[PDB]
Amino acid sequence: GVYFNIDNGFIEGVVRGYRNGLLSNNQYINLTQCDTLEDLKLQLSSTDYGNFLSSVSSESLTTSLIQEYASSKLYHEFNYIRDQSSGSTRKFMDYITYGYMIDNVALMITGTIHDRDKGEILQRCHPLGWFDTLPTLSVATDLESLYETVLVDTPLAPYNIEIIRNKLYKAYLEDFYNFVTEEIPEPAKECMQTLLGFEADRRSINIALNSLLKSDLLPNIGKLYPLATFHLAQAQDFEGVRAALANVYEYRGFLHFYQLEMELCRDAFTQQFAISTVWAWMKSKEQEVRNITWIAECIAQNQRERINNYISVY
């Protein structure tokens, strides 16, 4: 790891400085005792968020507003790191956003197939995956038409609505699996094969869990590709997938997906000359912008029973 700090030294030093802004398990105990959104704003400014709500009023402080200012503060940091990267890392951070724009073309089709507005639907769309053709999504509702018309110029071009979603997403995750084993060096090889495999795991389990052929729409890059793909392909009931998921020692008893993700993410920061840190920060800060939102929904309406479901390993 003597060549990493050439192009990725300032990059990793600032990403490792962003994971100290991940507010810890003591930083939620004092943050779950507010009962008003103003008070939460008052003591969220002491963190490394650092008074990001200094421009909004206090009378009109919506629950969503905190969800989108904290995510805008996430996403400006992401494309702050992204436009400072070399050709082995600018691609890797683009391949992070390629799985986001699949969830954006999956939502633009299922929003434009029904009677809905472009502007209102566009607001919900995730802004890291955003190509210039994505605001259209209205030339045709046919799946075949979209590829030639609108997806031909995208970087989704080498890759019914959920059927073409998993058809894009499996070929994406296969192409993202054999990229991180080709051009990314040794301390992030074992990371971007295991962490990525986990993402293939909890998507392939959600295939059979949402289906209750299926062998072509399931990604095969993880630990369930050789053995559990055939057992999970012919599972028609919940007990068939419950018996098929017992073969893996790391997934037995789970059928708890994000808790296993965050525990697999806290070991990703244990390496310190790897580029798996920026994925661990992205999924950790995207975790703690839905932890803050889960707390602020229990504060906006008084739901004091189910607050302690936030999950922080860092």
Partner: protein
């Protein structure tokens, strides 16, 4: 990459060409080391002493400097508290500088006769390999102190839990550089000037 396996075929063919035709004693590295000027070896050991020392010193500096500038975007006090990690990367270049000053004093003009004698070839080989010893040991200690002082920068983001242990292995890389210094001062310890 193909040119490595093309200049290896030439060395095999030219070796077996000299060997099979009875003239394999023409490829003699001894007469090469004995007709070659000692000022070549002595000053390609001085200039590659301070050369590879600076190359490792700078290799350490942009590893831990570009780490603690990135780590200093949120915690700016690290760059004036973890500047001890860029001291020992740069004392590597000091150790290649001291060797250069000491070595230079053994670098005098020799006469026409007494030029390819025993002591002149000795001090040519001695300043050559000692300048490589302290130049490449300081290249490795500069890289080592850089990659372990860069883990001192992203661990001084955490307050005080690890820096007292990290420093111990920071100065363990300095000791290796010093031990490399006192080997090149004993390799050329008995080497005389050019007489």
């Amino acid at each position: 990459h193909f040119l490595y396996y093309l200049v290896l075929i030439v060395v095999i063919v030219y070796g077996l060409y000299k060997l099979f035709t009875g003239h394999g004693s023409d490829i003699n590295f001894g007469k090469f080391l004995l007709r070659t000027s000692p000022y070549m070896w002595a000053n390609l050991g001085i200039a590659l002493c301070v050369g590879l020392s600076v190359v490792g010193a700078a290799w350490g500096i942009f590893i831990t400097g570009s780490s603690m500038i990135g780590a200093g975007v949120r915690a700016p006090r690290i760059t004036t508290k973890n500047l001890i990690s860029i001291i020992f990367c740069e004392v590597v270049a000091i150790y290649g500088l001291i060797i250069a000053i000491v070595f230079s004093s053994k670098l005098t003009v020799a006469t026409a006769e007494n030029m390819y004698s025993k002591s002149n070839l000795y001090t040519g080989y001695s300043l050559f390999w000692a300048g490589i010893t302290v130049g490449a040991s300081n290249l490795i200690c500069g890289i080592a102190v850089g990659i372990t002082g860069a883990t001192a920068a992203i661990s001084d983001a955490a307050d005080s839990a690890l820096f007292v242990k990290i420093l111990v292995i920071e100065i363990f890389g300095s000791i290796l550089g010093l031990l490399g210094l006192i080997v090149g001062l004993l390799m050329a310890g008995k080497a005389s000037e050019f007489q």
